[PDB]
Amino acid sequence: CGRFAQSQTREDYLALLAEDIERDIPYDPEPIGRYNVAPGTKVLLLSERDEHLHLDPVFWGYAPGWWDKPPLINARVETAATSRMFKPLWQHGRAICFADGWFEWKKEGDKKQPFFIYRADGQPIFMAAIGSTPFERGDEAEGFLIVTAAADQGLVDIHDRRPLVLSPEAAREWMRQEISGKEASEIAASGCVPANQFSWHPVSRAVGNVKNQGAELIQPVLEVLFQ
DNA sequence: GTCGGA
């Protein structure tokens, strides 16, 4: 899960959470406007610190100094709480990345067709994230990862993994600093949105190229073509 | 100390 859309205003997404949250985040009513959010850019990320919600631009990717490979963009839910690498992020670095949906490229051999995946009920999504705190320091290499889960039901036909998408109520619990890593694992296991609540459709090849932009990137195309 | 198109 390496591309998604985050096009609406921050208040549009925060409106889905508990009522006393949209006020914690300062007012900025500009639509975020991003139909092609890619790794290695700064992405607005929601988290809680000192008992208050914050929305911070955080690098999408994780590469500490001892990691001499390209930054990771995902963390597997099955093992992240116990990983030597991710355990500290699971414990103290949990965060939420809201989106309109995400893109996955179905493969035949190495040829690909992008699909956009979204809530059938028309709502946005809250993706579970873990990252390096303090998030506000604008680090250029130790940022956040999107947690992944096994694809289920019809999503298996597009790809065998999916982002961990949490219900609004679960997303709020996930961000709390006062919960244990074990509680977080139970939130991830209890609050995940199931595959039957999503729909998807093929989109134009244009989105694969990070250069391309705009609302047309999430519009359906008629023909599926693996290229 | 691990998991995306071009």
Q: Which nucleotide is nearest to A2 (CA to C1')?
A: B4
Structure tokens at A87: 């355990």
> Separation of CA A184 and C1' B1 in angstroms?
21
Amino acid at A204: S
Structure tokens at A21: 């949250």
Give residues lining strand B (CB < 7 Å).
A 1-3, 38-40, 61, 64, 66, 69-76, 79-80, 83-86, 88, 104-105, 112, 148, 159, 161, 205, 208-210
Structure tokens at A128: 């579970």
Strands A144-150 and A74-76: parallel
**CA separation for the pair A150, A115 (Å, rounded):** 17
Q: Which nucleotide is nearest to A107 (CA to C1')?
A: B5
The partner residues of A5 in beta bridges, in order of sequence, read A101
Half-sphere exposure for A28 (CA within 13 Å, toward CB): 13
**CA separation for the pair A124, A222 (Å, rounded):** 24
**CA separation for the pair A61, A149 (Å, rounded):** 18
Structure tokens at A58: 């955080």
**CA separation for the pair A185, A221 (Å, rounded):** 38
A29 near A109, Cβ under 8 Å? no
DSSP assignment of chain A equals ---EEE-S-HHHHHTTS-TTSTTTSPP--S---EEEE-TTSEEEEEEEETTEEEEEEEEB-B--TT--SPPB-EEETTTTTT-TTTHHHHHH-EEEEEESEEEEEEEETTEEEEEEEEETTS--EEEEEEE-S-GGG--SSB-EEEEEEE--GGGGGT-SEEE-EE-HHHHHHHT-TTS-HHHHHHHHHHSBPPGGGEEEEEB-GGGGSTT--SGGGGSB-S-----
Q: Catalytic amino acids of A?
A: 1, 104
By C-alpha distance, which of A189, A210, A222 is closest to A103?
Answer: A210
**Domains of chain A, earliest start first:** 1-227 (3.90.1680.10)
Listed resolution, Å: 1.6
Residue nearest the C1' of B5 (CA based): A208
Residue nearest the C1' of B2 (CA based): A72
- Which bases on strand B have an atom closer than 7 Å to a protein beta carbon? 1-6
Q: Which nucleotide is nearest to A79 (CA to C1')?
A: B2
A11 near A44, Cβ under 8 Å? no
By C-alpha distance, which of A126, A138, A111, A143 is closest to A38?
Answer: A143
> Separation of CA A74 and C1' B3 in angstroms?
6
**CA separation for the pair A76, A17 (Å, rounded):** 25
